[PDB]
Amino acid sequence: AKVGFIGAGKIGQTIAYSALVSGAVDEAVIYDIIPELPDKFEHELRHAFATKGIKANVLGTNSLDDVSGMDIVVISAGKPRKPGMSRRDLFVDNAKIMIDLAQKLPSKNPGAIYLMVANPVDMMASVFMKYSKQFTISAGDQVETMRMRSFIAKKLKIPVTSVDGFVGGEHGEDAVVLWSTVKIKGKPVDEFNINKDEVSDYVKKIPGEIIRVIGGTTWGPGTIIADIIKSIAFSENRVMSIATPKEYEKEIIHVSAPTVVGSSIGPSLESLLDEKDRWHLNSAMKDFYEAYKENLKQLEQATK
Amino acid sequence: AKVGFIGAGKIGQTIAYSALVSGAVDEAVIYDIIPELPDKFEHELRHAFATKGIKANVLGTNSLDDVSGMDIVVISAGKPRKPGMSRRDLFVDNAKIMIDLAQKLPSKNPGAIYLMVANPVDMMASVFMKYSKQFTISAGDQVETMRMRSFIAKKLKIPVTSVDGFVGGEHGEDAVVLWSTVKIKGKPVDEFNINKDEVSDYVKKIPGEIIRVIGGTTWGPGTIIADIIKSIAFSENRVMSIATPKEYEKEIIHVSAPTVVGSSIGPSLESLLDEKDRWHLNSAMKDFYEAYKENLKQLEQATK
Amino acid sequence: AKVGFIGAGKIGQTIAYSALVSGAVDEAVIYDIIPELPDKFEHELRHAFATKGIKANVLGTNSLDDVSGMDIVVISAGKPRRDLFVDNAKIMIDLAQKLPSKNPGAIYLMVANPVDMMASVFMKYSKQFTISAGDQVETMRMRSFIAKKLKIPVTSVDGFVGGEHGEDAVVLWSTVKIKGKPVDEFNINKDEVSDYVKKIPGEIIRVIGGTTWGPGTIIADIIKSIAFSENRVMSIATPKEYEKEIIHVSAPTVVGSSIGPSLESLLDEKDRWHLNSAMKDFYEAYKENLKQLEQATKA
Amino acid sequence: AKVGFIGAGKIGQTIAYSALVSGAVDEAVIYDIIPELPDKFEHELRHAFATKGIKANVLGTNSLDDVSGMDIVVISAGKPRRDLFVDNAKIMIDLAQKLPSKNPGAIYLMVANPVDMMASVFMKYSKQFTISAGDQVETMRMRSFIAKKLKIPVTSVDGFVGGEHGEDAVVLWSTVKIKGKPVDEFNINKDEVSDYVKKIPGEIIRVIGGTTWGPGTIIADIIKSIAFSENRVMSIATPKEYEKEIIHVSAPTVVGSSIGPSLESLLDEKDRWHLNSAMKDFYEAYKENLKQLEQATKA
């Protein structure tokens, strides 16, 4: 696929690297406001390509106009999410960038899927789509999903390949494990000794721990988000807990549920979950709506 | 995954090769009735492994008892399907083998998924599960699905990665394209100039053409079926038009629909298709039931 | 790489399959004299491609004229001794007249047997740079055997088989290393190894047969090493000048976007010796085979 | 392979990431002095693994004692001239006392700078077979540059950079080949190439910096070539005897389950020459650096 990267920070680069080396991206244009960053990153990529035999086309640019004719545009531009900053405050910071980008990118990229990575990620997507009018998904809880899976694996001392299931609903600390999806060696999770609350708060707390010690989350989200790009690029039909647009009284919101991801997206599979999880998902919609609507009002004091 | 192969014919070997070289299989036991075939195939595999650095464990055997402790058992043992032989006649040939195998394998392989490849494939699976009592899926119409996709790609002169969708229902000539799933560059299929009947009969006729000229179908089905094994082994959650057991008045039948395939299978996604395709799927169930029930009666003159 | 395949039977299909799913081949043209076989093989490839997201352009053809513009041409066209040389050298001489002017600058890789001898014939008549698969397969057979014998991973065995092809090949024991360590430090019945190499193909052939998966994958890896410019040392048979004629003998050779050098000079003295015996013996047998061909007469 | 990683910063994390998702590393132990960094890095790896189905065992540790039983040890522990040698040679001398008795039979791969010099120090004191990443990165920089300059795929450029590390490295022009053909047949400003190699890291470092993706991937490929026994020729710096001391100079070298031979003997005369200048110059500078270290005094 031809993929455009808006943001060449830590997560931008990890995502780009990982999707380029897997083959999911044959052609990429990489954009940032920082002068000469895209260019130097491109040199890095080209050196990495030599040892692998990768002939993919790559352009690092400081000119937004060079991002045109893309199939997918991955947006990771924005201030990071450190503990002590509320969702509301980050929203106020970062929505500006999305509103700006909504005015420029759609012009140069006709049928492009927009993939949001910048936080607060599902809210960033809802805003970007509100103003861009382009189809926009959020990476959502696919990362959370893989965190849950690896944790259950280490705890039971089994390979991760024996764990199935999804985290969904709202992003980050508001995420919920969809327990009706979770299976261990193919069997209901209730047959095993696992403490659900422990799993749930590992998932919610680990990104904060990682940021505290290292300064940022990269290898995990960047591979996981690159695997989303790959399932689109290769039309793999992987079910992923990304967040897709839904109409709700009657604004557009994004919430995560297991969704079929291929050359086309989706459908989402919320209708196939048990009662408890459909309930948690409904609740997530109500709460997202409330919070997002409020933040939208606040922001709209973009005075005079 | 630890995978057992019952049948080391042309399709057995292609499936085994393809799943071993992808990494989906770390451990395999390969079984056939033909003396020394498994053994010589194992030598071949080991030579192939040297150049790739593959350390997977492989055992070619003529003793059925060596196939134990497997996660997945792939059954491709049986006489092939040549034009001029009815489904009924092949059923009568091949059900015998499945009934035999249903009596031996479950004993040595506790929690194993059984994957049917031998034809008539969905009927072979229904019989194998009837008598083995083990969870059994059929490769179903996943091959048909990939045939449809590549045909639409060549006809429109686009990459296959821009085509999404599934074939389902009954196997082979009775398959139906699920048109509500089919999208080209993400858009409804009705927006493009494609002749649906042409696509449908390419899918139905091409395996016969290939068998006529070459004597058998291998590279296509064997990679496609190896990708099913891979989505189980790596817990990828690829949606695939395999055939899973359903209870119908109230015998167990297998029919294909898009199904989530991971470490756990599924659910199937028939409830999310449009009306026309849900109808075609219901019809497929009625017809399979009728035909399978009749063939079961016939076979049951296993006299005295 | 753009790769043309001459011969779409068992070994040609395997190599073409393996090289396409590894991503080493961007574009292929596949040719056979059997009517509609390449067409149907192309169909099988396209169905396999759909599941992997592979978008390489592939063309099955019954018209040799359609094989043009390639980077590498792989020749596996063959008929089922010495007679064997004559029978198949005619195929090569006919291809030698056709391929070069349609494939400016292409490299040729010989697979059809007798492989070293057929590479030599084809380069004489075509005048194009031609390599033979040589003893790379045997090399991998040797490594596979040692590793199974010592219950270790095949990734802990290093080494090459070289010289002549097939039952005349020699194990180059100064290259063989277990866990990074000289072979003489270990429990290795050399005769048992060398013997497994010579006999295992005949055994596979008898039961199956012949051989597809092993040499298909191994030879596809030569194509990969060329196409990705990996510089893998492999014991292919490259062309060498000897007594005014061009011959093919297998030795460890750097295989990249450029092919060479050979590494015979870096071997120990006994191995350098067996390789000279091999060049001499191959020359004699090649000229004796050329003679019996020159009986190409007009009744 | 079982691979231990000493240093889990920017370059150590990258190499460890790349080697694990390539499947070259079955098992890793990762160590750093920064408290809780390896633990958190291990968490990040596990989340990445879940999406790919990778099941390699990985351990982040703040206890060096936990790095035992490895096949390969990769050292990227470093402090941010000549002073640079002294500062980091202390790290190496301390590791030299600890690692060998816990890692019987392991191979060591030096990444921390000055890389050739640090490999040499560490093998003197540890007495273990030690290689340096050397000029493999530069080699890939050279290929990347030519190919972008001539608008061709990087897979059509072959060649190596060798001798000393970094700004003292030399392009080995007799190895450089475009489309399988001698470099002198093409439009190549050599000074422009050599100059791009020396200056591009400093430029990446200034803007970013420093360098992760490029050398991370390139060095992970050395690990891969060892672990899968691929026999890729790479210009790493292997140990050579010179004036009773052990030194590291980069040359094209076969890298497999066993490491070697070097290929300097197969170069042209000018390149053989620059490599001898390089061994001499590296010796002098290494002994001058050893001297200033031996001022390890007790106030």
Ligand SMILES: NC(=O)c1ccc[n+]([C@@H]2O[C@H](COP(=O)([O-])OP(=O)(O)OC[C@H]3O[C@@H](n4cnc5c(N)ncnc54)[C@H](O)[C@@H]3O)[C@@H](O)[C@H]2O)c1
């Ligand atoms: N799982 C996830 O969804 C996930 C994971 C990691 C990071 N993130 C989020 O992604 C964002 C980036 O994280 P990071 O580590 O890369 O931060 P970073 O500070 O490294 O990089 C952000 C980059 O964005 C650029 N930028 C800022 N405004 C821009 C604009 N208008 N146009 C183009 N570029 C612009 C900056 O120049 C910088 O290089 C944050 O919001 C973070 O919380 C999300």
Ligand SMILES: NC(=O)c1ccc[n+]([C@@H]2O[C@H](COP(=O)([O-])OP(=O)(O)OC[C@H]3O[C@@H](n4cnc5c(N)ncnc54)[C@H](O)[C@@H]3O)[C@@H](O)[C@H]2O)c1
């Ligand atoms: N898409 C698909 O589902 C697909 C594709 C190709 C082939 N097939 C089917 O798979 C079956 C095999 O096709 P093939 O090309 O490999 O045929 P084949 O004749 O090459 O091989 C079948 C093998 O099964 C073995 N066998 C027979 N009975 C056995 C028993 N009781 N136990 C163990 N082994 C036994 C034989 O010894 C033989 O080696 C056929 O029924 C064919 O129609 C299905």
Ligand SMILES: NC(=O)c1ccc[n+]([C@@H]2O[C@H](COP(=O)([O-])OP(=O)(O)OC[C@H]3O[C@@H](n4cnc5c(N)ncnc54)[C@H](O)[C@@H]3O)[C@@H](O)[C@H]2O)c1
């Ligand atoms: N290690 C090796 O190098 C190795 C391994 C296996 C086979 N081989 C050799 O390769 C050859 C092919 O083996 P196979 O197993 O594929 O046998 P095969 O008989 O299945 O294949 C031969 C194919 O070549 C085609 N062919 C014959 N003459 C031709 C011509 N003039 N032009 C185009 N196509 C032509 C035939 O139609 C047939 O499809 C044999 O000579 C075999 O000995 C070499």
Ligand SMILES: NC(=O)c1ccc[n+]([C@@H]2O[C@H](COP(=O)([O-])OP(=O)(O)OC[C@H]3O[C@@H](n4cnc5c(N)ncnc54)[C@H](O)[C@@H]3O)[C@@H](O)[C@H]2O)c1
């Ligand atoms: N091509 C190459 O060979 C190449 C490329 C890049 C970097 N490097 C070199 O590698 C080194 C690391 O670079 P970086 O970018 O990762 O820097 P960095 O500062 O991010 O990483 C250094 C890490 O090593 C750890 N460390 C320091 N002393 C240690 C000790 N005694 N034991 C264990 N860990 C220790 C530090 O805590 C830190 O995490 C530098 O010397 C750099 O010059 C070499």
